[model samples]
Target: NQPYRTGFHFQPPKNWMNDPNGPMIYKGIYHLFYQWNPKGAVWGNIVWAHSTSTDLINWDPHPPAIFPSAPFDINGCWSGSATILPNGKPVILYTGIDPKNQQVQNIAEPKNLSDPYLREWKKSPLNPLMAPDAVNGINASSFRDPTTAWLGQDKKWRVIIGSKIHRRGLAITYTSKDFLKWEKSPEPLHYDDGSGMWQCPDFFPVTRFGSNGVETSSFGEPNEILKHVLKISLDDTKHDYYTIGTYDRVKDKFVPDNGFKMDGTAPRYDYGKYYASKTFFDSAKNRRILWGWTNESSSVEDDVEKGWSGIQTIPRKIWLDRSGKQLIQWPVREVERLRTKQVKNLRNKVLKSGSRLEVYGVTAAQADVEVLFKVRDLEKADVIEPSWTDPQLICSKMNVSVKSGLGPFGLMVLASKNLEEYTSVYFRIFKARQNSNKYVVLMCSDQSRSSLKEDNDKTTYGAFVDINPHQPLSLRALIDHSVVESFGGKGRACITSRVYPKLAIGKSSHLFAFNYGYQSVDVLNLNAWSMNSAQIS
Candidate 1:
């Protein structure tokens, strides 16, 4: 639907849903929990909204798992991950916000407390799990997004959290035997290179990517290659960053033999616009999948109008590419299962019209589809045009703007062929503070980067078109037909951009084109998949 990093082009159910949390396979079912603000659609009173599925497709939303109330987690349950007990029950561990002292609180199950406290799901227990420290193990006050997992190699529970010292970025580690009480590690994880703040850190041994330091390896254990994902921070910045290494459970710290930035260049993950990423390992499915919250450049005032604000990135299967220097991302297989019909199927066709090539098939707001397009013959001519338009609609003027700049080829994803609240992503060569190679994707919210919305939500990457180029500029993306996950140029990208027009299959259809600065349209391979069913391989 929308372009630029994957985002929610489709409107989810009413109310609020943020980062996808505790996404894991439990008892043969894939369970997902997210940061939920249940009071009004606007963001505030927080909790966890739970949903379950046999596959990633067709989710079954559950009632609120943890809502704000009296005793435990009363203030607000921020974001955290879930793990299954040996007995087969899902255990949720999350961050609790205490409004009283403005401290970060922690709450766990097997609940206890006084009478009224029993009914309040939001009220956290009396004692704080960890308090803010100007200098200590994990910045308690600033620490949030507790990523907990069972490290079978060590047979202990590991937790990673976001923290800051004098505003410098860092992550704190904690180990536990029972999940209730935890022992904190002394020094923070490696933080020589400056990061604003580290949030949401989870570690699992991966297979298929090789080990961290091995020259012949890709990711994960040397023999079993799997990539490690470190999704931190917020807003629409970049994707994963930091070094990949082995953590010694006995010593309780990460020993990084050799580490590289998630995106080799200086402006990794688009330079601090993205944050709060979590991943799940589905043993039965044999896949390591990731999910992140794709946010706008700034906070939106329209959450109340539409009954919701943020949206999540489509699930991803994270792997290590052949060179073993970066992560390779592809849309989760489960999403493909949702493909119900082929509104219009086309393959390797060059349109005669130089304007726009319409697929000519209306799609409902709730539909899902896969589009694989190639734009070639860019001899100074506009080659591609893909837009979505609805008959009856008017978006906020401030939230609607279009961007077309120089690149090997320009790709635009639209909600309606003509609308403001849409998203777009393209590959280009640009100058950055660091090495200027390839800028894989540039994501924009409904409001272009020109407009200022909120104070804290403003982007730090600065405003301007990205002019960087690496080899292989061709891009691959999968849309729910709402959220987008793009991989091709610099690594992987996820964006929470939204588009309108409430039609899954209607009078409104989508279009695509290849537009260049100084050339005519050439030939390129284009394929579309109306996903029917998908699963992890």
Candidate 2:
């Protein structure tokens, strides 16, 4: 196991910890709960692991908050949402499956009419507050996994639950004033009967649309300026369909507004193997943070050796661009506070050939770095050639027969370190053999890789951003020790990827080297700081 003692913790004591469940502000603190399996740490029986923070940055793990104790969640306490109870505590609404009946419901008892469900779920003592009649034609058994939020001005409550269509995937909404009671919203925000189930349906304000196919962000809050939903649609039985969209909450449901598809948004989030994410509203602090799960592929041999699997991502900020039609994001305000120093800020440009770029001895098991490259006079030239090769260059649109060529030229970063335990960012513009193409790629570890590999699905994270030749195109990259968030064209498109780099390997200083030909330049705004810079420490 890659041990991350502080800053951002890694795989839990047992084998598995995935999508953070029940994340919300409780009482006066920020609580983050996740799907966990205490036995071996790998993914199996699911429970809830809880952690709290007075400030969004520093987290203190509470005891495992929710276990698979009740009959309702005996088999597994899958994922769900958490809200403040009327009595002042937090109320958790989660998905449960009766191990014995789970498989049966899907196959064995397909003909049983009254309760054909082979999967037996012990309903919460609170039971189904909104009856089946309330959700139109959706079934209660299909009525699992609910995301709750407070309605605007009315002080009422609303919920979006994951359901199935023709026994497949469906997302339904419900509203309530009292916590225990609910009235199902007449129309389902989404119902793709031919598709699979939609899990972790979040209904909130998005500054713009998510890269995914859907959009559902909220307003009313001063800081919140987006309008979309960051969604995970379970397409087949195993993989998830990652998407975001422009949603109309005014209709009390998610109505897709933008034409953006998940793969097209330049997946700012890691496109490796991780999915199933949720976010919290820090109203008092005016920030939005997210958490998601990282799981393994169904390769048993590797699973046994690792003895565990899965992890949650760090907190991220969500916002909108100047157009309000696109979203802009950063690691979170406090994460910047983690920056230790300003290594160096070169004025013009630097090329990688004997660049002799050196960092001022700043290192960490946890860290963040920003690399900005500005292309100036290259616009006037017919083309500019990119430097270096690796996964970054291999996937380039330019037919790189020569180490150096000329066209709209540029080269981006691949894994900064080794393959498996590293991160990569790429940006390239090429016009070769009479064909022109410009694309930005972010390559990280494969989210589904069971064991580490020398090479992963390098083609996974691609978000083609649109940039005009009016000025220099900029690339902003954030390196957080184990995670890498890259923005091309001044954040028009982003590629976020996570890795499991070893602590020992993290000591090497990876400078923001650029090979901007005379008019072209790799301009870096390097900060010289250490992880100890965190205000808490």
Candidate 3:
């Protein structure tokens, strides 16, 4: 009954959980395994916790599938991925901390394929399939998190393991003929210096058109509408960034599109509080689904008080944009089934400067809201300063109260009646130059005024949205008790945050549409729904 817990997000009954592992559809069932600390609400005693879902929304819990059973994984079982073989059998390749505390790769399979849930698993006797040694030229401690193995046209299996060498982030490749004996390639599949350690490196293919998802091992196919995506979670920044690129089979290398920087102006998978993401292709639905672990923004003491520490964002359906320069993500269509009832709908409503209107009739504490904001004019946009390169810094400085030409107009979610506590998720438009009509959209989630309580991490997060004034700018927000997940410009940019509002808890919370800019904005269409809590525990 607390206000700081999510209603529809994925989490265990209790305790700590991190990095999603080995997510796949097996025998018409969706299996999600993750890094869990079975002992307490902190990070230790790590193992692979298992759950199965007929639909991605509701889950059936199972005992741990993989723990420190064998000597090769005695120290701990880390993050990994799942690969379905040609024979319809699924195999898991995950990072294992051995008795010596060195990171190694291990293989596991189901004891019986006939078991629909795949509840039990057995580690291969030929365990420690890959390990760091002098002959392999690998940094033992740095190597971990093997990706889902992809089959090449040459009838060989290949997978990339994340590692680091001094200042370089590396994706080292290993080839296996029979899935037992492994050989390392002379060079890494990819590497970027000064990028720091790459954790949870995921490589997958995406189609340029339609929402259909391509398989990981689908290489050299007939259609030319395919591009590969290389995503890595940076240990230094604690955020995941990806690049859309072309893969050359002959060279076994990946090259990003022009002007694509690793973590530059390009939009990240999420701008706030999301990390260690993994994507899996759904064979049944012919779509790719992405899952990421959202860590708590509250203090460790608060987590202990709450009896949980992390949750997975709503499973997102991902695809490559037509530009082929980036990816677009949205909450999977299936999540709409959890929309129990429509609460409010506003159309063609205009909000003037310093105006605020409450979106009534919903539960307010747990809900889904989608709004279409149409800017009548772009000429009033603020001039972009050359010195303001970081969108986050710009957002923190120019907050919601700071008036602008076009915006600072958006939503005020999870707020109290007195306005003493609120989390403002808004958008601001900036002109490229003094006379240029070109514009940039900056979306921000400010938690500075989210709560009256002290000692909370009330940091502001922002991202640049690739949008034009012609198209109606859309925003979708899923506000749970403790979480605020937002999509900007129809998934062009996203930001997820964790907020603990003391006054805005329970039925006291409220939702509102606001405009703090000098210029007016039209609410083309606003639809919100009260969300139903999923059977996650």
Candidate 4:
């Protein structure tokens, strides 16, 4: 019953876990598989940890699907994806560390499809389907993390494996005729120099209307025009950045709508302690779901003492925005089933400067809150400095205590009543110039005052959200005990943070909607609900 453990997030009882792998729906039930260390709270003896969900809230933990058993994977079994074939059979192609210490790709199948929980999985006798060699010039150490295979126009199966050559990171493609014999493509599917090794590369199609998710193998179909998303987790930076682009069917090349940039303004799935993301289409709901692993910001010693390390941020339903420039992500609708409405629609109220109102009636430690703040005083916004390339840099400097004309008005979650400890999830409005109405909206989740624990990382995470600042801005926070997952500007930007409050644990925790700006803000609607503890372990 410690406060550091998450109430609604996805994690087992104990030990270390990272990198969500092969999340999919089979036989009308949802399944999540991830990297786990069964030995202890630290990373050790990695395997594919399995769990199945009937309602997407409660999960049933199962035995490991695969581990380091055979000579091909004697050293380790790493990350990969799951693909359902045309014959209604599900398959997994993951990277296995061979006896020679080289990374290799292997295939596996669900031994019995009737169970559908995939309680048991069997690797092929001809394991190590793909290996590095001099002919391909692939560095064995850098080749790993195979993506879910998609079908090509020629009716052959194609998959990509992430790799690096010197400093250039890219995804190499392979085509298979029978899902057994594989041939390597001559040119790389995509590559970027100076970005370093692309850890987990995800390729999928999205529609223009931007709600329904297109199938990964839906390319070359004459009826629909589609755009593609290529997301890569950088080895150097450890952030997941994606590019929306057009894919040529014949030549098999991708051209981004905007150039891929490592600069601060680039499009990223998340701006906080998130990494190694994966996405799969939900056939039952006609949407695409995204999953990412959030590592602990607390010290390794604290993790060992607490007996746990990482968690999967709530599965998000993702789609392309109408403009086709970026993606929009919101918590899957299924999680709302856990809500027990607390504060129902307090509407049309003006929040004065330096005002704070406590939200009561719900368990503040575990709650879901949504607020729509109407910003009318666009002229009062602070002007941009131009060199504030990284929004996080701006957040680190202009903290919660630093107020502006029309800024720093948002929520205080996972906090104590006296405000000695709190994680502030707020937004600041910035203008393009002193006179221009063009605004750059920055959303930040500051954990600097989150706890009395001095050794915690307490990194302030933020991003420049893409939305009309002149319109009513939307902010939603899923506040568990230790983790606060926030969606700003109606899911245009997201930031997830971990808070270990010394005094704000258990029933002592509180929630507040605050505004520190000089100008008054309008609250169109404020709604919150107590969240039920998910049966994850």
Candidate 5:
């Protein structure tokens, strides 16, 4: 527990967890349900485990909410979304694997409405309300992961199911007048050829100019209209991708913005160790919250030895950027409440090339840090010739050890005294070839030298940040015992990494801010804080 378990991130007492399910607020309390394995630290015996929170930071656990009970979900209770009806009642729409091993959609409702936590749930007699058929041209094995149903202008409820037809991944649509009966729509809500199967698809609207969030049912309304986001997890790549777009109510289709080529895209909820993400409106704060699952990078033997295998990333507040092209995200404000003390303050300090400065007076293993890097000159930055279409490939090609003119500059976290084991959350700048004066910033979390354990994953993750290089770049990192969640360019690009260090454990771990570029960089401001563990169990 000293070197691996997270202090602030959400995890149960023990065992395996993945894919947040049916997250919503009921009567002022927040409920989060996840796909959990109760008997062991491996992926089996799947059930929906329940938890409640007044604030998102701390949690109170409860028994399994909806397990394998009916013949519909006899095999397993998979992932799904929760929808709130006009009468203010909450209902869950999930995918079930039946005896025939076919994936189908089913419904469940709260057993006790008066219970603030909504502790118990009952399966609907209308189980399997929507099913696959040849007439609908749906592949029975490919249909699953329904979206939150929303009410249209005609007062009919509409929802989507993640499915596929050979190589094309699609969101199959269904419409219903009453919650009990549903009919398949003629056309799919959206689809992309050669993208493979889509899992845990999410579609929702965002405010055009502000951080406020609107309900899904607000579609087709005059005041609530802005841009809609269609996010999908590509089964082939295991990465969550999204495109900002518009909702065509008359046609019941989602039109991804002009620039996106969904056959391939660069946008993702997290660049590393994260998948199967879901988002819901936080009515309590008028914002949208995102939840994602990050699996262990350690070997199965180590996981079983540790007795835990996964943890959820911090709950993030998401909104459309002012550019209206990408999503912006930040840890919810409540996380700051766990900050025990501030340390290692700096401002207007110049970091010379080949320099490294230790960050002290804080818990090196579990800390939160924010910094702004100022670059006065960018004329000598390296140039990109190939348009650099794939960022992860470029990152793998040029790691932190291969420094350039402009950088390999940022934080080295979870490190030992001589850096025998360390992980880097850093950024590099390059001049755009297509556009002369424009810049493309590559932010990467390099885990190649993270651990002395050779069996653990040492993969690196990267993302391109959209920003003017003349301005100072911002980075925020939350470091737990074995994990580091780094936000680059003011949350424009995020990368989360999992590390298992042999020497950098507990009080022995060290932190540093370094620059390896030819040119020196300035730290306009810096702040760090030690964090206390939350009531996660």
Candidate 6:
């Protein structure tokens, strides 16, 4: 038995996996292609592995959808996306490593569209559609990962490719009138000097009204209900950062909202162990779903021993927040299908300072938990000092045991019975910029003490949550054997951690709700479920 394997998360039976590629729904079937190393646990012999599902829960596997074929992709077939045409035909454009070892873009089409699975694909005769022109000052080696194409009002199709100009990360733009002949934009779609090369750049529109996702080609007059999101996976830090902004159809450039940019410490799709994320519009459900790869936190030796290196986080539904400044994400509702029964339920329980209460009845190692917390006194919250700039540094310095005015209260899941090992997913409120009335909520996942094993990387991660001071704080955590995914303030901030708890395996594991704040905090409602493993095979 694979003790560390996840139950409901999306992972192939074996091999190494990375950046999600060409995830799209066509004719009622969802297709997922990812960067897979077919031979071993290490990254090499890459090919695009294919799978299909009608419901996103059970996947039907197929042979390598697109491998190293033809002169254009003889070396490798890398990350790209699929675009559904106006006539409902889907086309894939991907990065192909040429024989010269240069990166180029290629297009592929289904040989049989009538087949529901769309099993086979053929590369276009005009392969290597886009290449860096030395005369145009593009870097051939750095250009890769094309975004899903969108059509403007002019009827011309547009797509962005990730590239860089020395230290500046660029979202280079190209326009095609016939989906074949392409021309580069005079200037990049966007760039930032503070960040290095951007990989797997994604640009799409998010509606402000409902959680439903807007189509990629949806265009408007920059109204209040619609906003564009530009996300870049930073090659330097391996962090996926995103910004909500307005897209100018005429100039073909994206302008981020104030205080948000490609280079700044903008909101991330995830805070820990997640990268190379991509989102696609789920036309069937009218929502946008995000998929990200979580790499192994253990050493390379451990990965080889385990025979797998990566797993995709549960698909998340993302949309623009009312603040218009950030995007909110939550696991797709489909994840609830795995919940077998409600194991523990609590309501209106008040926790005094230094109190720890065990939440019994659930399989602690594999469960889903949601808790709402009501802070009684905001005035007692600790003051946020100007020096506490990095939330992560602050969280690393403080934990659930640290006494404070308004928090360190939340769930401690996947813990040993003695509490020697536990990952604290909690919140701490602080007065920001002396704005006593407007407080800052710091949501953290403290994993420093999560495991007794020697192989795990126990890094503490934290994010400042945006919340109205009057609203009750809420958190939902998905706990699998080795993975703990926390959504704080209903996804205003998210953190995923990979833990190897030597003592907290299976039924031996325990769950607890603790409070360390001097001021009492009331648990309005708490619900947790025991999750059953899905039929992944």
**TM-score on alpha carbons, each prediction:** 0.70, 0.71, 0.98, 0.97, 0.97, 0.97
lDDT of 5 at 169: 89
Give each model's whole-structure lDDT. Answer: 0.47, 0.48, 0.87, 0.85, 0.87, 0.87
Residue-level lDDT of model 3, residues 1-537, one tens digit each, is 546767888897888989999999987899999999888888889889999998899989999999998888999999999998988899999989888999999999998779998889989978999999888866788999999988888877889999999968989999998888888877777888778888999999887787789988887768657788889898899999899888888778878888675665445799899999999989899989999998888899977887888888999988888776778989888887778555688898989888988898886878898999999778778888899878789889987889988889888898889789888888888888867568888888888898877878799998888878667888999988888898987788888898888888778889999998899889999998988888987
- Candidate 4's displacement at residue 381, Å, is 1.6
Tens digit of lDDT per residue, candidate 2, span 52-110?
66655666555665566654456666677755444444456766655432310110011
Model 2, position 215: C-alpha lDDT score:
22
lDDT of 5 by residue, 1-537 (tens): 446898888987899888899989989899999999999989988899999998898999999988888888888889999998887788899998887888989999998779898888989866899888778767888999998988887878899999999988889989997877898998888898888998898989887888888788775557655788888888988888988888889889989898684557638888888898999988789889999998789999987888888899999988898888889999998998888755678888889987888888888898898889998778868887684767777778888878777897989998888999899888888888635788889888888999998989899988888877799999999989788899988889889989999898888989889888778888999888888889997
The reply for model 6, stretches above 4 Å from the true place, is 221-224, 433-436
Residue 497 error, candidate 3, Å:
0.3
Clashing pairs in 5: none
| Model 3 accuracy (lDDT, Cα) | 0.87
Candidate 6 weakest ten by summed lDDT: 429-438
For every candidate, C-alpha RMSD to the true structure in Å: 8.7, 8.7, 1.3, 1.5, 1.5, 1.5
Task: Give the candidate number with the greatest TM-score.
Answer: 3
**Residue 245, candidate 2: how far off, in angstroms?**
7.0
Clashes of each: 92, 62, 0, 0, 0, 0
Give the CA lDDT, 0 to 100, for residue 503 in model 3.
82
lDDT computed for candidate 5: 0.87
Over 4 Å off, model 5 = 223-225
lDDT of 2: 0.48
Residue 348, model 5: Cα distance from true site in angstroms = 2.2
Ranked by TM-score, the better of candidates 1 and 2 is: 2
